[PDB]
Amino acid sequence: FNLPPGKSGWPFLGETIGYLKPYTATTLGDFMQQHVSKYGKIYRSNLFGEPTIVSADAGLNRFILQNEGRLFECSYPRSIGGILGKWSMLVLVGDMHRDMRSISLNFLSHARLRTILLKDVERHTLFVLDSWQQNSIFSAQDEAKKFTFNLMAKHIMSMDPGEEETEQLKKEYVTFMKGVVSLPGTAYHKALQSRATILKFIERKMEERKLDIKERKQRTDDDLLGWVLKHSNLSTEQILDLILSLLFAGHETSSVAIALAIFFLQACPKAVEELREEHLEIARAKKELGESELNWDDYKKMDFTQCVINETLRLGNVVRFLHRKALKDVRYKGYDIPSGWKVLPVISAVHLDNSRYDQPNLFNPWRWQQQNTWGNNYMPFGGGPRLCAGSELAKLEMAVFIHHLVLKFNWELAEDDKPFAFPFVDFPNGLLIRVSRIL
Ligand code: HEM
Ligand SMILES: [Cl-]
Numbered sequence: 001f002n003l004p005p006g007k008s009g010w011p012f013l014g015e016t017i018g019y020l021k022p023y024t025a026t027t028l029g030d031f032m033q034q035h036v037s038k039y040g041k042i043y044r045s046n047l048f049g050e051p052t053i054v055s056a057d058a059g060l061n062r063f064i065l066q067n068e069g070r071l072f073e074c075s076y077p078r079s080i081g082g083i084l085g086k087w088s089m090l091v092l093v094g095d096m097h098r099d100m101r102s103i104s105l106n107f108l109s110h111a112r113l114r115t116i117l118l119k120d121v122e123r124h125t126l127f128v129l130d131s132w133q134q135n136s137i138f139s140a141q142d143e144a145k146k147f148t149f150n151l152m153a154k155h156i157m158s159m160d161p162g163e164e165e166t167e168q169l170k171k172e173y174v175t176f177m178k179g180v181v182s183l184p185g186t187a188y189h190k191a192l193q194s195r196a197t198i199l200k201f202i203e204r205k206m207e208e209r210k211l212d213i214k215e216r217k218q219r220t221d222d223d224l225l226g227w228v229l230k231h232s233n234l235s236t237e238q239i240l241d242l243i244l245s246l247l248f249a250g251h252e253t254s255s256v257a258i259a260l261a262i263f264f265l266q267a268c269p270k271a272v273e274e275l276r277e278e279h280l281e282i283a284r285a286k287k288e289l290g291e292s293e294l295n296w297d298d299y300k301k302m303d304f305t306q307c308v309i310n311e312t313l314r315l316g317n318v319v320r321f322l323h324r325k326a327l328k329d330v331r332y333k334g335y336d337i338p339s340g341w342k343v344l345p346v347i348s349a350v351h352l353d354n355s356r357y358d359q360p361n362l363f364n365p366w367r368w369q370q371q372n373t374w375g376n377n378y379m380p381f382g383g384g385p386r387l388c389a390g391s392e393l394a395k396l397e398m399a400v401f402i403h404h405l406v407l408k409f410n411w412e413l414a415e416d417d418k419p420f421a422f423p424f425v426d427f428p429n430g431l432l433i434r435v436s437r438i439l
Helices: 016-020 030-039 058-066 094-107 110-129 140-157 164-180 189-214 224-231 236-266 269-289 303-316 365-369 391-408
Strands: 042-047 050-055 072-074 137-139 324-326 330-332 335-337 342-345 409-413 432-437
Touching: 016 030, 016 042, 030 042, 050 058, 058 342, 094 224, 094 236, 110 140, 110 391, 137 140, 140 164, 140 224, 140 236, 140 391, 164 189, 189 224, 189 236, 224 236, 236 269, 236 303, 236 391, 236 409, 269 303, 269 391, 303 365, 303 391, 391 409
Parallel strands: 050 342
Antiparallel strands: 042 050, 072 324, 137 432, 324 342, 330 335, 409 432
């Protein structure tokens, strides 16, 4: 019987404060690097109020991910467990989760991806990028968040950008997100108030949709709200939790990824040159054909863009680790994971590994003309039965945004900045950039 080595830290809190200490997002951070150096890639700790096995071992992390529902299961801390609702897909397990995942996969199907969703992705890209003024200075992080929130609101509830009900859902949504990152104080009871308001807003739009469906109007299931009403048997409270958890799942991730790409690309002008060549050829082809909107076949031509995307996610690491629990005693590589203990697969660790990538701290999208996303080396979307249901939409959002960005603008940092993990990734100075339109 061999328990992994490590400390236990302070009572109640353990090593949580040190574990959560902000660190530059392109690294693992002092706490993680030092613990791996002293104890190895598998070590024990006391985190988020529970005894914990931390894993920076890519072989163990894929074993955990693939054995969801058998040896391990998703398990958030008590505080974080319930802010997205009892029926949040990110927290559910068992049959209910299997049913909610099947719904998300079907709504995000390839057929719907290449017709419905792509049109909205390009429309929302141009809604943002056409408002950018010459020689202006602004926060790219805020613009990225604008793009992805607008886009998600369209996808889930057919809301249009810039309209009042959408700008007000943003303020309510961010006030609610100030609860996840937290006495409770007046900034936690405020987040529960906002959550209730949001749930009442979603239930309002749900009743309007049930009327559209009863009156047999066409294309009622273009958004997620209409889709679950027509194609599922979820209850009202289940629908509200699904809508809210999808907004979070799709916006918090995609916004960071877009911002990371803007950041990495201004420091890699040769990658922007190759992107312009690839995207100018696509645009020239459509001009000769007299076609205006992008189609799936144009997206399939964005080979080097997919290299930038993979490199952005490998180096930037939108998600630092996952929250899991062991369902029974497990033995792996000679260590014992006791039942009921928390298990944290640090899926970001292998992305920064010297032995799996050559110069992992360098942004080098050309490495993906040799490497591949299959296997242990690459898991920014997770793995196993909970592998990210929106990954294909995420890549499409980045590709379409990049396409119009490099065709319309040059950009530079107006103020020094760097990404940090809190563990959520964010730019402290807001990623201010100056832009100028091309010829
Ligand atoms: C760069 C963008 C994204 C990244 C890095 C990312 C990452 C992840 C990861 C690591 C998980 C696994 C959670 C776990 O195993 O506990 C996950 C789950 C999920 N993601 Fe994403 N995601 C991204 C974009 C999106 C988008 C755009 C959507 C939807 C519009 C989405 C929807 C979901 C859903 C529904 C799940 C739950 C899957 C399940 O429980 O079976 N994601 N994501
Ligand atoms: Cl490499």
